[PDB]
C-alpha cells in the first residue's frame, strides 16, 4: 500500500530546476545537467526501487538507453511498478520520452511530492542497484 498525491497550483510548495536536479543527483548518485535527461525512465525506475524495494524488475532496466524504444521499455517497467503499488497517476509516456522540458518538469514535480509522501529515510547504495 502506497499513498498518492496531487499537484495543481500552490505557493511556497515548489522547487527550482536547479534544486530539483540537485536532489535527483544526490539521491541517485548521477550527474544530470538537464531535467530532460530524466526522460530515459531509468532514474524513475531506480527511485521506485528505493521507495518500495521489490516493486521494480531493475534487471530489465536499460541504464544506457539512447533510443525512444529503449526509453519506452523503461517506462513500461515504471508503469508496472506503479500498478503493483496502486499509484493511480497516469504517466504521460509519449510526451515524456520526446525529452521535452515542460512535460518532464511537471512529472518530476509530482514525483517529488509522491516520493516525500512515501519515503521512510532508509539508506541504500544505489551504485550496486545500477550495477
Amino acid at each position: 500500500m502506497a499513498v498518492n498525491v496531487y499537484s495543481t497550483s500552490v505557493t511556497s510548495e515548489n522547487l527550482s530546476r536547479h534544486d530539483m536536479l540537485a536532489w535527483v543527483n544526490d539521491s541517485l548518485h548521477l550527474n544530470y545537467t538537464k531535467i530532460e535527461q530524466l526522460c530515459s525512465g531509468a532514474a524513475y525506475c531506480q527511485f521506485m526501487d528505493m521507495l518500495f524495494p521489490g516493486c521494480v524488475h531493475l534487471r530489465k532496466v536499460k541504464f544506457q538507453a539512447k533510443l525512444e524504444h529503449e526509453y519506452i521499455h523503461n517506462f513500461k517497467v515504471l508503469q508496472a511498478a506503479f500498478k503493483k503499488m496502486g499509484v493511480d497517476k497516469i504517466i504521460p509516456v509519449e510526451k515524456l520520452v520526446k525529452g521535452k522540458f515542460q512535460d518532464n518538469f511537471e512529472f518530476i514535480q509530482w514525483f517529488k511530492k509522491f516520493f516525500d509522501a512515501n519515503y521512510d529515510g532508509k539508506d541504500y547504495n544505489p551504485l550496486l542497484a545500477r550495477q
Binding site: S9, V10, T11, S12, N14, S16, R17, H18, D19, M20, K100, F101, Q102, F105
Partner: protein, 429 residues
C-alpha cells in the same frame, strides 16, 4: 550583399511585422504574390537585403514568424500579403504562454525554440553576407518577451559577430495592458541589456498621442500605429537598400549612437507627420523637417527628452535635398538647444542621406535619439516591480514554472545598475 534576417514574436511582433513587410514590398515594387511590378532598376538592385529570390521571378521575405498561439498566424496568412511568406517560416505552437515570461522563456517556448533555430540557421546559410537580425516584439507579454529573449540569446551565441537589433513595444506609464507586465518587462530587459546591440523603444501611449494630436486621427486603430512603426523601421535601413550621398548602415549607426555598450536603448522618431487637409498649407523643406524631428511631442517613447540630455542623435534623411542645408540645420539645433546635449561628446549629431524618398513624399526623416531621459521609464518599471515583488504577488505563477527568486532579484539589480549608469552620464560635466 548585406542580408538582414527578420524575426517576429507574438501578437504585437507579428502585427507590426506584417505592416513592415507591406511597406517594404510597396517600396521595392513587390505585389502580394512576390512578383516584381516596379518601374526602376534601383528597386531590384539591393532587393536581396530583405528578400530571397525563388524560382520563376518571385521574391520571398527573409522573415520568420513565431508564436505560441496559432490564431495570429492564421490571421496573418489570411491578410493582404499573407501569401507572400514562405509557409515553412511560420513556426507556431498550440499552447500559448498565458501572459507568463517563464512559460515563454523556459517551458512552452523551450519546446518550440529548436524548430525556430533550425529555420534561422538555414536562413543565415542562404545569405552570402549576413548583416544580422531584427526582432519585433513586446516586453510585456509572455511569448514576445520570454520566447523572444530566449531566441535572441541563442542567436547571439551562434552568431556573436553579427548585429542584433530589436523593435520593442514597451509598457505605457498611465495604464497597464496586463497585470504582470512589470515582471515581464523587467526580465526581458535583463536579457536585452546583455544580448542586443541596439533597441528601439516604442510606446503605444506616445503613438496614440501622435495619432490624435499631430495626425488628427479622432479614433486611431492599431493598424495606424503599426504603420508609423513600420515607417520608422524602413527609415533605419534605407541607406543600406538605395544609393545615397552620405550612406549609413546598421553598424555605423550603432557606432555613432552607442558610446558605452549597455546604453543602446533608443527613442525613435519620424518626420513629417500631417493631417489630410493640413498638408496643402505647408511646404516640406529640410528645416521644417528638422524642427518636426526635434521635439517631445514627436517622440515614440513616453518620456520627455527635456527631462534629460541627448548623448547622441542620428538623423536619416530621404529625398533629394541640399547637404549644406542639412548640415546647417544640424549645427543650429545643437547651438540653440545646447543645454539638452551632453557637453563631453562634441558634434553629437550624425547625419545620413538617402536619395530615394518613401512613396507619396518628396522627403522624409527618421530620428534616433540616445537620451538619458529614457532612465525614467526604467525607474518606473523598477518601482512597479518592487511594489509587487516585496509582497511576492503573482510569484507562484513564475516559480511554478521552475523559476527562482534569485533570478528575479538579479534581474532587478541589473536594471537598477543601468539606471544608475544613465544618471551618472546625465549628471557628468
Amino acid at each position: 550583399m548585406r542580408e538582414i534576417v527578420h524575426i517576429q514574436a507574438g501578437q504585437c511582433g507579428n502585427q507590426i511585422g506584417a505592416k513592415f513587410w507591406e511597406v517594404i514590398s510597396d517600396e521595392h515594387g513587390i505585389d502580394p504574390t512576390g512578383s516584381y511590378h516596379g518601374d526602376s532598376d534601383l528597386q531590384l538592385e539591393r532587393i536581396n537585403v530583405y528578400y530571397n529570390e525563388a524560382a520563376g521571378n518571385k521574391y520571398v521575405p527573409r522573415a520568420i514568424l513565431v508564436d505560441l498561439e496559432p490564431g495570429t498566424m492564421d490571421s496573418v496568412r489570411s491578410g493582404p500579403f499573407g501569401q507572400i511568406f514562405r509557409p515553412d517560416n511560420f513556426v507556431f505552437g498550440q499552447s500559448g504562454a498565458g501572459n507568463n515570461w517563464a512559460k515563454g522563456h523556459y517551458t512552452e517556448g523551450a519546446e518550440l525554440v529548436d524548430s525556430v533555430l533550425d529555420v534561422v540557421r538555414k536562413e543565415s546559410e542562404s545569405c552570402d553576407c549576413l548583416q544580422g537580425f531584427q526582432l519585433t516584439h513586446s516586453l510585456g507579454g509572455g511569448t514576445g518577451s520570454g520566447m523572444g529573449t530566449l531566441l535572441i540569446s541563442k542567436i547571439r551565441e551562434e552568431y556573436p559577430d553579427r548585429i542584433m537589433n530589436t523593435f520593442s513595444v514597451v509598457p505605457s506609464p498611465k495604464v497597464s495592458d496586463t497585470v504582470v507586465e512589470p515582471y515581464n518587462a523587467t526580465l526581458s530587459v535583463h536579457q536585452l541589456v546583455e544580448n542586443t546591440d541596439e533597441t528601439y523603444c516604442i510606446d503605444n501611449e506616445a503613438l496614440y498621442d501622435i495619432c490624435f494630436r499631430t495626425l488628427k486621427l479622432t479614433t486611431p486603430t492599431y493598424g495606424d500605429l503599426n504603420h508609423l512603426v513600420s515607417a520608422t523601421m524602413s527609415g533605419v535601413t534605407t541607406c543600406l537598400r538605395f544609393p545615397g550621398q552620405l550612406n549609413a548602415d546598421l553598424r555605423k549607426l550603432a557606432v555613432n549612437m552607442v558610446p558605452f555598450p549597455r546604453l543602446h536603448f533608443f527613442m525613435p522618431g519620424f518626420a513629417p507627420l500631417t493631417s489630410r487637409g493640413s498638408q496643402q498649407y505647408r511646404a516640406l523643406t529640410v528645416p521644417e523637417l528638422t524642427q518636426q524631428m526635434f521635439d517631445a511631442k514627436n517622440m515614440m517613447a513616453a518620456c520627455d527628452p527635456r527631462h534629460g540630455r541627448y548623448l547622441t542623435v542620428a538623423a536619416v534623411f530621404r529625398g533629394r535635398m541640399s547637404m549644406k542645408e542639412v548640415d546647417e540645420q544640424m549645427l543650429n539645433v545643437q547651438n540653440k538647444n545646447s543645454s539638452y546635449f551632453v557637453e563631453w561628446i562634441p558634434n553629437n549629431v550624425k547625419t545620413a542621406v538617402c536619395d530615394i524618398p518613401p512613396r507619396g513624399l518628396k522627403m522624409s526623416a527618421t530620428f534616433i535619439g540616445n537620451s538619458t531621459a529614457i532612465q525614467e521609464l526604467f525607474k518606473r518599471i523598477s518601482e512597479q516591480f518592487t511594489a509587487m515583488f516585496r509582497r511576492k504577488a503573482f510569484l507562484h505563477w513564475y516559480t511554478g514554472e521552475g523559476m527562482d527568486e534569485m533570478e528575479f532579484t538579479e534581474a532587478e539589480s541589473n536594471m537598477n545598475d543601468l539606471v544608475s549608469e544613465y544618471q551618472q552620464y546625465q549628471d557628468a560635466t
